[PDB]
Write a protein that binds this ligand. Sequence first.
Ligand SMILES: Nc1nc2c(ncn2[C@@H]2O[C@H](COP(=O)(O)OP(=O)(O)OP(=O)(O)O)[C@@H](O)[C@H]2O)c(=O)[nH]1
Ligand SMILES: [Mg+2]
Ligand SMILES: [Mg+2]
Lengths: 435, 116, 74, 534, 81, 86
Amino acid sequence: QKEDMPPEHVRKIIRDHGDMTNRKFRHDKRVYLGALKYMPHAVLKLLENMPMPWEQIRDVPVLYHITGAISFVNEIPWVIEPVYISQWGSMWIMMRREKRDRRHFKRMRFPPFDDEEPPLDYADNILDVEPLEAIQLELDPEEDAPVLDWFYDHQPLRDSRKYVNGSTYQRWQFTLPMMSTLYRLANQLLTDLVDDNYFYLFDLKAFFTSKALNMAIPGGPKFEPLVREFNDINKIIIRQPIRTEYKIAFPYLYNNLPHHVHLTWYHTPNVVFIKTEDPDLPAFYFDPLINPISHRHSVKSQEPLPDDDEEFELPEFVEPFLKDTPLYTDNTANGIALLWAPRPFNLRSGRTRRALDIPLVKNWYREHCPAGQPVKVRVSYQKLLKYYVLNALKHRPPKAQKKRYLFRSFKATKFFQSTKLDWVEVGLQVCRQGY
Amino acid sequence: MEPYYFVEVQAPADCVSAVYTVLARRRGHVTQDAPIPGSPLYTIKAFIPAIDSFGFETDLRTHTQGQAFSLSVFHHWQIVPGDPLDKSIVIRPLEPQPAPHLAREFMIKTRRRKGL
Amino acid sequence: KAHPPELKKFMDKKLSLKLNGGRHVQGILRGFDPFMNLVIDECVEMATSGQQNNIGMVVIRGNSIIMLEALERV
Amino acid sequence: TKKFTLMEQTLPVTVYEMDFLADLMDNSELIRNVTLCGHLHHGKTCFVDCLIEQTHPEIRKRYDQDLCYTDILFTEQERGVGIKSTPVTVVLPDTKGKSYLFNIMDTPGHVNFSDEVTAGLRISDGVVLFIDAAEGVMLNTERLIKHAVQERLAVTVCINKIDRLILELKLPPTDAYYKLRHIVDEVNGLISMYSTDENLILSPLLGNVCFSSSQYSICFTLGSFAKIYADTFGDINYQEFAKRLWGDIYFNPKTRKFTKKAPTSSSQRSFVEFILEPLYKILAQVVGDVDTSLPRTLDELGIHLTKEELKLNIRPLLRLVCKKFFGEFTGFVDMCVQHIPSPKVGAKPKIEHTYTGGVDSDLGEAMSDCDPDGPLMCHTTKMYSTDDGVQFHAFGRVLSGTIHAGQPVKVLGENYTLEDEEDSQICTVGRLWISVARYHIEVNRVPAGNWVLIEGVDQPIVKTATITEPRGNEEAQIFRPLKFNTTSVIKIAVEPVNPSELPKMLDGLRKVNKSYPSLTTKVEESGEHVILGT
Amino acid sequence: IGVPIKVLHEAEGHIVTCETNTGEVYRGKLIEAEDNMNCQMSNITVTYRDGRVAQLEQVYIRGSKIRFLILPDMLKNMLKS
Amino acid sequence: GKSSKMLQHIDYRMRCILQDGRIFIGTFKAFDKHMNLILCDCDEFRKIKPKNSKQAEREEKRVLGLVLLRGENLVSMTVEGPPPKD
RNA sequence: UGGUUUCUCUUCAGAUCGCAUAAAUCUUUCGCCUUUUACUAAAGAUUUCCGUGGAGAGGAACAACUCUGAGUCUUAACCCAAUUUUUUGAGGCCUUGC
Ligand SMILES: Nc1nc2c(ncn2[C@@H]2O[C@H](COP(=O)(O)OP(=O)(O)OP(=O)(O)O)[C@@H](O)[C@H]2O)c(=O)[nH]1
Ligand SMILES: [Mg+2]
Ligand SMILES: [Mg+2]
């Protein structure tokens, strides 16, 4: 296999090819312009791996050209989803706590360096300097114990075979205290909706049906038309004004010509989940939010009572099955809380996702909103709903091709080596290379 | 005579007040408002008209954010409170006629429909 | 196991009992145990001669019971 | 393609039987025609999916899906309703092992679709009511209690979704027992109000009312749980033990026997302890203890999960543990076979409400005998559509005689009377289909008592009619037309857009009139089409 | 519990033939079959060792004193074992 | 050890000898602890087990069908012919 | 009964996926509108790209085994002797049939 190279190699190549004015490097001038056509892909792989405000330094695998023509970041950011949502919820908490507790927040100057100022050398200027502590909320050592060792690492439980597989970092298996702690760390970014009966008319198929017609929804998306002696007004009782969402709820019965219409899922059994406040109360007790029973009936029915002198006695080696085990532990109510929880938190185990594919704010623009809000954010929620519905509509399935693997084809050649560099050094390289 | 429907609504406690409002806005007369035993939801059993029962379900789930849930069955027939034969009452073209002459309005509309 | 024979249906009914040795008796079922030993009341021995003689209430050991037939409807 | 009826592609991998189905069809007392009704989706569909997932192995496994062996359309499979009353037939055993034959009419649960439930209910002799634990007695539950009382059938409720007591309401065991007892008491009250008869009172000790959660495939009756309890332990008589479990009955741990009050030292019932306590042990140790102390619990239950099975999510793991602990769905088979009067007995009270004449000395005894011979008669009531074809099959049950393929058919209509033979006409059987919900399989003959699809008689059968032998001196009446729970009130005026295709629209209107049993499509004096619905 | 016993219970409700230890032959409907082979039957035809027949409404034969039973062929189609 | 001695002959056609001296020939499909036997397509012989008796091979043969024999009354079994394929 | 991390290649997979969501071409319409790009907002027909699965082959290796969990001659003491079975109410005799 082609192996890793010392990280000083690409550093000296980039540094000797300074601005390509030496006569000694006049044969590599042609290759840098050739590498110009792959600068957008290098930019994409660069910014895809940006290091995540709870990280001081990220070391990325770098695929570089042997003349220093271009530096790629040969890595995909797999970020296991409960950990990523918990870390950004922790970021949300620390940022609100920092913004309220700071006398003056000085905003950065946005062209940070000057125009005639040459870019800094990475080597001295940043290899010497200490990295200035990241955000990293202080975790309770007793309450947040199964998370505290690994929570602000790069790819947290990567080198332990019990919680993930290997270093491809593709599958994860957690224990329920970990899921409970990660689920309560993410509450600032999550919702309180246990069932989707909230989304009766405000769901996806309803918005498809609204796109099919010219109808909009009061908090929903607005679209463009897709189609562009019987109904006598003396012969029709207008008893109730036909409210417009009837055309969504029952599309055939309320419209003429329902073409390209989608059917709607209209009811789920209302999930009644009693959220327990404090651990002093047991796992399952009769909560005072539930209406009592109070058995009452008219005449006692003759339900069978096999009386005495039935002489049926149980033998000695029989008991209730699991009376040896206790009725509940400290982790039972937490697991029942985990059963009604959003998609990453209702599960023990899953596949790792990319950092791109986790929308932290998606459940916020998917819900309709309390009217006291400004006009601005109402239009914004409506527009984000429009973008989501246009995503869900025009979803052609993945179209199974032959996989291409561009970077595996570059590093099979004799012109690319591979190393491991700090992300800031690669970003300074990519900027100098584009210049 | 007018048909009425029997409606059961399953709803939370403030949603019961919401159902009371919406169902009262359709000539309702709520029959029963008992809570459900062993559950934090309430059952609202009520009558409703059948000309007033076009979209009550959808309006209810709109106004309760999908918490209440309504089902409706036919069981009933009672008198429309208007005088069905009256020539003093002049009916407007489109405007919804009040309770004193709904029977005259309905008879005129069904007369113009087929029978003439 | 240690099962009962399913004979409650036949309790207090008149029965015809075929026993080993080509022996036959008739009487009313008054009870039984898991071995199929029977209590038969108003029992009558049906002698091979054809003659029948009243023997009263008796115990038949289930061991020697070949077959029984109800003379009633169950 | 003009097919939207979801993949018939007939390949049942059911457990070695193909002939055994038709052999139990020929026994005529070993067949149970049950229908399943409830207020709304109370798990009736998932439940039958669990029964079939029991039945058919090596395929028929679902992760967050399936539950569509009633839900086989595409508008049906996206709305959430089951709009059609898709029947199914299976053979599945009892606690003992004598495998019965079950014809399940899997009805809807919506108030607007009472037609389907009624038409299934008139063709089957027993009804199974599903009440959600966390709901209680509801609107359509009361309506179907009415309609079950009216058309003279056996009655059994079955409390489904009992997990919602455990995992959603999080009730204590004794409070949950109080809630279940309240549900049973309300069922008995609603029955006692309506039925003049009194020999139908349901109680868990009697064996008819069952307990079965069905996202996780629990199903026990008192007999079935006592069967499990005695199969693990020694030689307890599980019927007599099951007799003494429900209802204010306490276990004295020194005298080792069941009393009515005698330990009053804040104890619990025999049901509460023996049933609900280890059940909540299983539930809690799965949903909160899976990593810590679950295999310790499994080794005390004889449940061996493999390494790959122990790494599932909590819902598939809970379903798998409850499947390996409860096994087959034989408590349901107990409450069926002990309380469905399989159609020897079923003949008489049904025929004394369907048939126009009555008990009388020609037809009545011929029906009540119900041997697969004699004066060939039927009652088809449902009209199920094919995928592409205009033709749509009739569905009914053979009362007397048999049906052969190619045997011609006199379709006695309902506008027919005895001295008016102009309505009835003659056909010939195209094909005989018997269905496992999307598995349609052909038979050469169908004997008495069994359900059957008929191909080729579809032109005279508007909603209700009776099949008889052609040109045979057997003269008989019709069965009564269908009394409905609701009367069709909502009137809709209807007219086409383009007036050049009135005949094709009247054709399709006649087809949907024939398809739904309460659709009323008539033309009033002004010449505008009028559709009455529910 | 034995494999043949399960198959016997399966024949409950079917017409079966039974020969005793003494060679009397009983044909009719099997109502109940116990674990020990105790057999309740109805509407019987009995064929004695001399060849003569008789008719009985209701019978019950002890398992031990049964030589064998003939069951329908409807059952033949427990092939796992 | 193996338990196979019965399981080997399963599905085969088998000649079974009863305590009264009858010969039951059928397809051996199942057995149990007591040696209660399940015999498909079973016939009974009385007079002989033929080894090609030039006069005739078969006298007092009776077709029985599906037979369950109680083990109490079984004496012995030998292989009569191979399994029918069906 | 042979571990499982990891790297590369080949092949096949998208009718409920990748529980995420870009861009391009063509053909019809539009909508603004000096004209062309660059566009708007739809429809349909196609592609590219960022990622994924199943299977097979091969390598990399600081990194894992053969009286072992039981087997085709050896480890579950319990399927080992009061009527419902693996311990006989047996014993005796005689007639009929090629
Ligand atoms: N909590 C819980 N939910 C269940 C159970 N079984 C099914 N469900 C859910 O309850 C809803 C109704 O189930 P279905 O069987 O699809 O509906 P149905 O009860 O057949 O009623 P119809 O749709 O009218 O036939 C579905 O969303 C099921 O997933 C259960 O055992 N427990
Ligand atoms: Mg359903
Ligand atoms: Mg020009």
